[PDB]
């Protein structure tokens, strides 16, 4: 059977639930010794075995599981496995406790119900409705062929700008269209309601952002760490102003908004990856957050695109790239605010959170670097170099 | 016994208002500033309702006549600054001194006083209550704002009427050894092309021009900002489409062929102006280009604040986007490079064409930096750069077909590098 039959839960133990897909394929919810639950495709199913294909077949042909549908495999990394070059099956590797799961089902459903179309077409949905909290197990959306994520087309656009193949207005147009897309996304997501942030909510932000700042200061080495340590008192002072921001509107957000989540194909843009920030606990990715968190996530990512272009491109002229960094963030912010005005949704964006959340986003770049990609410390170092002394001169005036 | 100024002016020959052409008589004296000792400044209206600023001097030969260089009327105006009808406003600025000695100069009637000051009589005036030259408003705002990159203003004589005071006379410092930008900027690029200057040395004036423009706009913005209405940006597109139509239907040769093919793409850029409603409008230079900048010994001075001549006389005082001056200067910097390549034998075009692109970046960077340093980023809307830049190059076509036909090469080469 499947119950009796360690690293199985990790891509490349007791059983809680099993959805037999037939022919040896199954979607299992495995609990670890540390009370950690996992969604393990069983055949572990690798891209090509057919488990992702059997999931689409089981969803297209219809009590502990829920297989919803809406009307060969090649994987690429949660784990996203393309099926038939037409649908993307995304598994949920890590599962919460027996509590809230991935909010991607509620995010996509609210966007589709609000008229938001700048996203891949949803196909199916697999949900574990057995415990006290229904946990999302798999999502199936339409596969956009020949599509590239932001870390590919935005880098290519800025590289063409540095080579003179594009004008500044041509290079800034994607940043402006991303601003209008983000406003339509927030306007559709805010339809589910708004929640004023309590004094305990803004206090939890300060302690969390100060804790991460202390971790980065104590982990970033060499000259980059010395510059960050000198900046840390200034950053900590900005974190203290969060206590006076209680009552700011909290809505359903993307949670992990950056250019890599924006796919471009045939001149059209689509948003993906509504599973929440992976660095956040599983019981917080579905919580309502400020819309400015997505705004600072995208504007910081646009800044980082320019840093990457200068870093990786031989013989690059950094002058138009660095000018693009400032102009792309303005083009994004201007189009985002004006689109919220045309949608009568100006109330969900609180620009007082720009500087504190932007600083916290760059600190996470330090933490991501020391944990996954050590040389990446140059990106938040260059971003804060152009951002911190400018914002400090205004506070001292 | 002695007749008043009104009686003398009415009995004077209509040519009194002229420094050949004929004015209809008789004349009528609307306002008179008594400068003492037989000198005066009159606001005279002819039989065709045309108003004039006339420097007047009483003369025992003909009763009254128009002041000439040497009569002492410009001296008396300057002396009146170094120190009162209700219709006149005399504002003096730091540096005015009662210098003596007059000499005529052509630069709308200018008189050199003391060989260190320039008195300029505004010969032709607008109608009563109608807008005119905003030069007095511009110069006074720059002086009160601490702007010094201009000829030191000594004083302004204005007529207290209308929404803005009507300029009657201006007194500024005389700069006998100063060239305009079409001399020194062309000379800088030529020296760059033949290796006498480095690229960094040839780009420094472009950055200094950006700082000057930002200081100028920040001072001019101190009088206030006006948000552009939807009808304003709609009228901009109408005026720019008409100028584009006039250019396409007039420019000949291969330049006209390229402009005709570019016209649909240019009109598409003009269509995005409707989304720019609310952009800030301030007092601007209005006719801003390198020819308006004097340079000597590392010092820069902007002149000519009466507005755009091709614009209607009652519209040159209206508030305009600060980006219009920016576009005017960046375009003129482009044209400086085009002129160097066109006129210099055996010139190396590569360093000049690199300077064209780099000078515009140096100008914008210094302009943005100085605006931020003065906390005046709000007045510059860079979304207007491309549509207004295309409109400036189209105006070069119109200036060419009307005054200098071969000049069509300048906007042709500029648009060739600006279009994608
Ligand atoms: N429907 C789709 N069609 C084409 N490409 C997609 C689709 N969904 C995701 N991708 C690509 O897969 C990559 C990662 O997917 P994502 O869901 O963001 O993974 P994760 O959330 O684990 O980072 C993205 O860069 C995106 O380009
Ligand atoms: N800040 C994180 C980093 O991990 C990186 O900049 C990017 C790619 O992982 O994703 C962002 O959410
Ligand atoms: Cl890198
Ligand atoms: Cl010429
Ligand atoms: Mg992702
Ligand atoms: Mg994700």
Numbering used by the authors:
A (entry chain B): 4 to 8, 14 to 20, 33 to 63, 72 to 90, 96 to 104, 111 to 116, 121 to 141, 143 to 441
B (entry chain A): 1 to 19, 26 to 89, 94 to 117, 121 to 433
What does the article say, verbatim?
Here, we identify and characterize a unique GlcN kinase from the soil bacterium Streptacidiphilus jiangxiensis, closely related to Streptomyces spp., the classical antibiotic producers. In contrast, from 20 sugars and 4 aminoglycoside antibiotics tested, SjGlcNK only phosphorylated specifically GlcN and displayed vestigial activity with glucose using ATP as a phosphate donor. Determination of the Michaelis constants (Km) for glucose and GlcN suggested that SjGlcNK is better described as a GlcN kinase (EC 2.7.1.8) with a strong preference for using GlcN (Km = 8 ± 1 mM) over glucose (Km > 100 mM) as the substrate. In addition, the structural and biochemical characterization of SjGlcNK provides new insights into the role of these unique GlcN kinases as the missing link for the incorporation of environmental GlcN to the metabolism of GlcNAc in bacteria, an important intermediate in peptidoglycan biosynthesis, glycolysis, and secondary metabolite production.
